[PDB]
Swiss-Prot record:
GO CC annotation: cell projection; cytoplasm; cytoplasmic vesicle; cytosol; focal adhesion; nucleus; plasma membrane; postsynaptic density
One Gene Ontology term of the molecular function aspect: phospholipase binding
Subunit structure: Homodimer in its autoinhibited state. Active as monomer. Interacts with NPRL2, PPARG, PAK1, PTK2B, GRB14, PKN1 (via C-terminus), STRAP and IKKB. Interacts with SGK3 in a phosphorylation-dependent manner. The tyrosine-phosphorylated form interacts with PTPN6. Binds INSR in response to insulin. Interacts (via PH domain) with SMAD3, SMAD4 and SMAD7.
Taxonomic source organism: Homo sapiens
Subcellular location: Cytoplasm; Nucleus; Cell membrane; Cell junction, Focal adhesion
Comment, domains: The PH domain plays a pivotal role in the localization and nuclear import of PDPK1 and is also essential for its homodimerization. The PIF-pocket is a small lobe in the catalytic domain required by the enzyme for the binding to the hydrophobic motif of its substrates. It is an allosteric regulatory site that can accommodate small compounds acting as allosteric inhibitors.
Name the record gives this protein: 3-phosphoinositide-dependent protein kinase 1
Domain of life: Eukaryota
Modification Phosphoserine occurs at: 4, 95, 123
Function noted in UniProt: Serine/threonine kinase which acts as a master kinase, phosphorylating and activating a subgroup of the AGC family of protein kinases. Its targets include: protein kinase B (PKB/AKT1, PKB/AKT2, PKB/AKT3), p70 ribosomal protein S6 kinase (RPS6KB1), p90 ribosomal protein S6 kinase (RPS6KA1, RPS6KA2 and RPS6KA3), cyclic AMP-dependent protein kinase (PRKACA), protein kinase C (PRKCD and PRKCZ), serum and glucocorticoid-inducible kinase (SGK1, SGK2 and SGK3), p21-activated kinase-1 (PAK1), TSSK3, protein kinase PKN (PKN1 and PKN2).
Length: 143
């Protein structure tokens, strides 16, 4: 609508990385989702959930790692996708026990009861990941 400027809630970090402010209305959400559907390369992998934060990370497993597009969405969900082959590879399962933890500005963990996920953000924004996941955790499990 004239004067709605839905982009006010969207905070771009890079061409494949952004985060959203979470206070918008249900009607605003519809428009945000419409924007995502038309414009976001990763829309097809997220089960029609609004993407609240996304960005590339390297997920360590074994001696090395794999680069994945990580997507935090309403639900909540944390999907990870293979960005070259364009296939969903998995999710970090949400529960009340889920907890993110930043080791420094690149490295962060996401603890779940039967597995910890070891992620690296070469952009130096690991704290933004931890903060937003914690924000979502609070809205999901508290209030």
């Amino acid at each position: 609508p004239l004067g709605s400027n839905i982009e006010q809630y969207i905070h771009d970090l890079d061409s494949n990385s952004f985060e959203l402010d979470l206070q918008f209305s249900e009607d605003e959400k519809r428009l945000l989702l419409e924007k995502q559907a038309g414009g976001n390369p990763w829309h097809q992998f997220v089960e029609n959930n609004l993407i609240l934060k996304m960005g590339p990370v390297d997920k360590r497993k074994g001696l090395f790692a794999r680069r994945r597009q990580l997507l935090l969405t309403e639900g909540p969900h944390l999907y990870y996708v293979d960005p070259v082959n364009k296939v969903l590879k998995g999710e970090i399962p949400w529960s009340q026990e889920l907890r993110p933890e930043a080791k420094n500005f690149k490295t962060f963990f996401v603890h779940t009861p039967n597995r910890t996920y070891y992620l690296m953000d070469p952009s130096g924004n690991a704290h933004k990941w931890c903060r937003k996941i914690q924000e979502v955790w609070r809205q999901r499990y508290q209030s």
